[PDB]
Nucleic acid binder design. Structure first.
Ligand SMILES: [Zn+2]
Ligand SMILES: [Zn+2]
Lengths: 109, 85, 93, 148, 83, 99, 99, 82, 108, 94
DNA sequence: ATCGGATGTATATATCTGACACGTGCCTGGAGACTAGGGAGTAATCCCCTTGGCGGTTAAAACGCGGGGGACAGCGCGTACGTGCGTTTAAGCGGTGCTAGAGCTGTCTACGACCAATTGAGCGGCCTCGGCACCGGGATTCTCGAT
DNA sequence: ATCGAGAATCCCGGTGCCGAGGCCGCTCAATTGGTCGTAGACAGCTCTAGCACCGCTTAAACGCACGTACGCGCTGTCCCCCGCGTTTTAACCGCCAAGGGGATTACTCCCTAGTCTCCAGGCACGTGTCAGATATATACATCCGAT
């Protein structure tokens, strides 16, 4: 690239590359840290954030609301397949549960 | 058969046994000496020199360390020395 | 006073990039911050373990890629690897 | 405390049946510090050699071992120049059932034969395990010059 | 100023509501004591680690971060209270 | 003459009511007192932040709900609809909590 | 006239015999072939160290043996002695492997 | 190339595994379920083992890769290094 | 303790203190490492090793052998309350399982 | 020749001869003991590292390892392990 | 198959309040230029150990049959749980006052990292003998059909 | 309740073989000695928020009654696993042979850390307003008894 603007804009990201570089350097992970690791990690983090925010926004708009609340995040995470496996052991505060009822308990015809 | 006073002497503090504990090696000694030994010595029988870590760990959770059968005998037969100290 | 850093502004920028007309509350923002921190810790720790297993002392982009492939499930891992490779390639020139 | 009574009984027991060619006793007004004299064993190159030792009793006795140190100079792989003693009884396998008489007997047995497997001074240990006459000679002059 | 028998404040209707959210249509009469016992075990397990964390830091107040750390150490990550 | 609901048609409605909400179901003061009582054994005269109690409550309620789901599945497995203590015991055993 | 053991009294003998030994209960060559066939999807022309196959075999056997205990407990909970695939499914769901 | 090797996990082997697990009576549809679950477990472990091998620019799957893959899933194994 | 002897003997331990100190310094745990941490860690490791080995030897003597195989280690670990909890997710190769048959299955 | 590979075999054998002065050990058992020691070392060291990072420190002291031992070991193993470590440190200092 | 109460849930409108989105000052952390050195890339050699083939023998697998014990369905009972009503209880909210203790700043002293010299602990390679595996014969003990 | 016969398991004595434990040579990593920069231990001050108390609603809890449906036991049927015998298939063992790739060593070069200087991006603080919660009155889905 042009080697002129900020590193986040140089790589085309929104998440900070300098802050991620500092966190990797001062986090007691290794003696040295390469020059391309923060870019990769920031890209991965931004992709995951964009995915979850898209699903949560869809859930909120399906509920006639214009703000994402923890309930919408819980619905977006639980309904999806990969995001539920990635966050299997995670508890979302004020998120509730996904509504389902076992078919045995429904009234007989 | 009943033990005498001469054969009821602790091998560490040389006093009358109080709250005695009997290790699996059939070696008996009073509770304060046992606790001081386990805290500062090598965590074994001071006489036999055998590991008693598992026994103490298992019997501490149930307060079954003391030898009540002989403790009552010592508390009843010889009130003088035990009451004095 | 002491200042506390957070990923709030970047999360808001991504949100406005995805859904331009939806806002976000405060508790949801805190949950997002916790999620980002957790994923950072997971990937960085796995990359450190990979570097230590091979008698290296540097965390390069390939170790981050291997950590991403080991952590995330199939399609998530594929898309994350693609995005990271694209970002690094665009950054290096 | 308990240490004072234990040391008093220790002195009484030592007085009842003193061991062979060793004699220990309190230095003075306090029972904590002790001084001892040891004779070189007959089956050793330390014939007729008197050795002096100082004993310091930690205040938390018997649960902590006493510390003994040579006063005179001796030629032996298990004693350093300043009087340091390398023995498992004093540091490794000490149990409260032991007595000062027992550690003195252990020191006498150490004077009987050395332990070159784990020596305090490795050079004289290897020269001892290489030849015998050199060590016997030099120990003879050491006990003739310092012990006597 | 000690407290005693405060596990009876986890009343029968509260346990019934938790079961209804869990998806339970019918409940037996001995469920409540079992639920109280499980509750006590879980709370003791979490609070022991939380108090250990707050004691290592030379504090006399347990913070939200100590509880979050204890929960994460026990394998139950919590979102929304920091971390 | 007066209206009476068939047994089970009011408990199938509370399920829908409580699976659509996010509120906490245990009263806060009794749970806070229980938390303060439990933490007396480990260290005396502690102080709790207002958020520590909330974190404990929101973790514990979620744990209880997750346990009750497995309990309901265990009860259904035995060809019943009510949940006994043995369902809780089997769920806890299989999960590995007590072993 | 020929001596025959009633059903169920030889299964207990096998239970007592196999819970006292420590060997591997799966034949080695079929398991090695299965490992190679499964691994051929991810990367071709792979080579396996002789102890990698052994580690995989030990892990797989220690996993299946531990699964069958939960399966048996589910079967007993359902008031039976015969284990059925639904027992395996319930055990896996409660453990967290199926969900 | 190899195909249809899951049937080498015969009925007697699964019966022996069940007997060690403490099972007195077995139905007839257990074996296919066991084969399926074992195949899933093997795929899950071998995928991580091969990933570890490929990162190290190797062509031989060592026991260290298998041990690390098992430890990565909360299935620590003692005896083959580590 | 007096100096002029190996570090692992001043503490009275058997596990090495220098090796543990080096492994803590180069293990990417923290920037600095205190002077008493290796001693404490080595003491804990030695205590745990002795704890396992004592029960393993007891089981070996029960089985009329003068050697310890993985079966004895498994028997020692599984039959103890705290050791089983500590090593709960751990698999021991060539260890087998404990004998346990449910009472429902026994003949009547 | 073959490169040197460190292990805990010597010290495990020393402890074994301490506790049971007449019992040997196999090779698989020795490998299992080595793996167990490595695993426990990693657990305690990692917990101490995280604990020190939480409080904004730069040093792993005996306090951090003590608290890690308190966290990781079960109810009655932790007390004895802490006692043994404290005794070892006290003996090492003086 | 519905027919009509009776209940509860969903829908539309007004409103007002506190949390969300934006703007401003600034100060600390990130960017830019430069130098030094050690970590990692690449080429070359060695030899260990992985793959492939062959023959034999024999333990384990596959196939089949007889039957008995266990899984599954159907009935009946009575008791334990659900639904509804009226009464007592303590949570929830607001407001006030006090101070224990978390949080930040300034000094300085002891502790831990770096570096050079040195030598003994621990590793690799060898070798022997006793513990454990195996085989053959016998004693003891569950098991089952018949009384 | 028992007697006895066929089958399985444990005990004991003799033989052998290989791996467990001790030994020797040596190479490098742990120990000692000295120096220096800074981490955190301690004292002092601030001001946040955690705790305690009091009064008023009214929401949730509790106790009681009725009835009914579901858990549990019993009985019957049938069919599918189990135990045993005979035959077929391929696993296991010992052996030989080839070379692929893992593991070590030497040289080089360039990528990253440490340092100094500089400035703007993000954090704390303040403010305005509109999205959503609450209150109130209809509209319709749903359930239950009755022919
Ligand atoms: Zn005493
Ligand atoms: Zn004894």
């Amino acid at each position: 690239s042009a080697k002129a603007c900020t590193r986040s804009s140089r790589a085309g990201l929104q998440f900070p590359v300098g802050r991620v570089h500092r966190l990797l350097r001062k986090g007691n992970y290794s003696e040295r840290v390469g020059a391309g690791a923060p870019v990769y990690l920031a890209a991965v983090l931004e992709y995951l954030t964009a995915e979850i925010l898209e699903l949560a926004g869809n859930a909120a708009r399906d509920n006639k609301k214009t703000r994402i609340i923890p309930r919408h995040l819980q619905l977006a995470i639980r309904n999806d397949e990969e995001l539920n496996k990635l966050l299997g052991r995670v508890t979302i505060a004020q998120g509730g549960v996904l509504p389902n009822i076992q078919a045995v308990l429904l009234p007989k015809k | 058969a009943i033990p005498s006073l001469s054969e009821c002497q602790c091998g560490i503090c040389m006093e009358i046994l109080v709250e005695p504990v009997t290790l699996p090696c059939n070696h008996t000694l009073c509770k304060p000496c046992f606790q001081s030994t386990v805290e500062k010595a090598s965590l074994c029988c001071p006489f036999c020199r055998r590991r008693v870590s598992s026994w103490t760990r298992y019997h501490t959770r149930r307060n079954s360390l003391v030898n009540v059968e002989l403790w009552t005998i010592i508390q009843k037969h010889y009130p003088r020395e035990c009451k004095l100290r | 006073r002491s200042r506390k850093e957070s990923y709030s502004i970047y999360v808001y920028k991504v949100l406005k990039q995805v859904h331009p007309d939806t806002g976000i509350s405060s508790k949801a923002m805190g949950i997002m911050n916790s999620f980002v921190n957790d994923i950072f810790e997971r990937i960085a720790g796995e990359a450190s373990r990979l570097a230590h297993y091979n008698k290296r002392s540097t965390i390069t982009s390939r170790e981050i890629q291997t950590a991403v492939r080991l952590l995330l499930p199939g399609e998530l891992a594929k898309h994350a690897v693609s995005e990271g490779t694209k970002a690094v390639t665009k950054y290096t020139s | 405390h308990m240490a004072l009574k234990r040391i008093n009984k220790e002195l009484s027991d030592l007085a009842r049946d003193p061991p062979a060619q060793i004699s220990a006793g309190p230095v003075g007004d306090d029972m904590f510090h002790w001084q001892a004299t040891i004779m070189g064993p007959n089956d050793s190159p330390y014939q007729g050699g008197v050795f002096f030792l100082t004993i310091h009793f930690p205040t938390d006795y018997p649960f902590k071992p006493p510390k003994v140190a040579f006063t005179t100079r001796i030629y032996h792989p298990n004693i350093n120049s300043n009087g340091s003693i390398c023995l498992d009884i004093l540091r490794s396998q000490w149990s409260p059932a032991l007595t000062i008489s027992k550690v003195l007997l252990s020191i006498a047995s150490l004077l009987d034969d050395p332990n070159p497997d784990d020596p305090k001074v490795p050079e004289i240990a290897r020269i001892y395990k290489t030849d015998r006459d050199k060590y016997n000679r030099i120990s003879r002059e050491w006990t003739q010059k310092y012990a006597m | 100023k000690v407290l005693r028998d405060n596990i009876q404040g986890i009343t029968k209707p509260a346990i019934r509501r938790l079961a209804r959210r869990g998806g339970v249509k019918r409940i037996s009469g001995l469920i409540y004591e079992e639920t109280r016992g499980v509750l006590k075990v879980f709370l003791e397990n979490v609070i022991r680690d939380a108090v250990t964390y707050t004691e290592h830091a030379k504090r006399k107040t347990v913070t939200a971060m100590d509880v979050v750390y204890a929960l994460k150490r026990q394998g139950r990550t919590l979102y929304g209270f920091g971390g | 003459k007066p209206h009476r609901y068939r047994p089970g048609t009011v408990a199938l409605r509370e399920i829908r009511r409580y699976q659509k909400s996010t509120e906490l179901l245990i009263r806060k003061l009794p749970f806070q007192r229980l938390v303060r009582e439990i933490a007396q054994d480990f260290k005396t005269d502690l102080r709790f932040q207002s958020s520590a109690v909330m974190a404990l409550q929101e973790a514990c309620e979620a744990y209880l709900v997750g346990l009750f789901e497995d309990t309901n599945l265990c009860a259904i497995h035995a060809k019943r609809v009510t949940i006994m203590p043995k369902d809780i015991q089997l769920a806890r055993r299989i999960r590995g909590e007590r072993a």
